Point group: C2
């Protein structure tokens, strides 16, 4: 079908380099792309909300800034989860 991250360009904040590498590799497995934190091309920023209290750049209007659950939830469901149910706050 449509892989979970088709046409998504992800980025990550709040993860160790080992964790981020794992999530980048999983992103590609699941049909998406990834770019560095703050890249204006990104469609999504996935945050470890237990670590992050603010963002180090001003998001574009298109950017979905989502809690980690959106990422692993999309993979579990084999479908892009609705971002609006998982927005990062504060």
């Amino acid at each position: 079908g449509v892989p979970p991250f088709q046409d998504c360009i992800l980025s990550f904040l709040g993860f160790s380099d080992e964790e981020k590498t794992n999530m980048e590799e999983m992103t590609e497995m699941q049909g998406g792309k990834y770019l560095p934190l703050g890249d204006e091309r990104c469609t999504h920023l996935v945050v470890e909300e237990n670590i992050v209290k603010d963002l180090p750049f001003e998001p574009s209007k298109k950017l979905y800034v989502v809690k980690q659950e959106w990422f692993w939830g999309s993979i579990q469901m084999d479908a892009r989860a609705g971002e609006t149910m998982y927005l990062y706050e504060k």
Copy 2:
């Protein structure tokens, strides 16, 4: 005299990529090296304490976890600033 980051391997948490690459370039200009976040070989982790409130890994007993002002403070001082003076709020000093 001695470069401010001589013998230091830095790493960064709480920065955009743009900021991180600027800091990496500056680290090398000031005589240090850098490695990825959480690498056991790092001597220092520089934290943007307004962006993060915890770390995504357990530091080694040797690691200096410092707030951002240690980095820029060192450059201004033209010397390696005190890692205890600029200790990150939720770190202890090395053991």
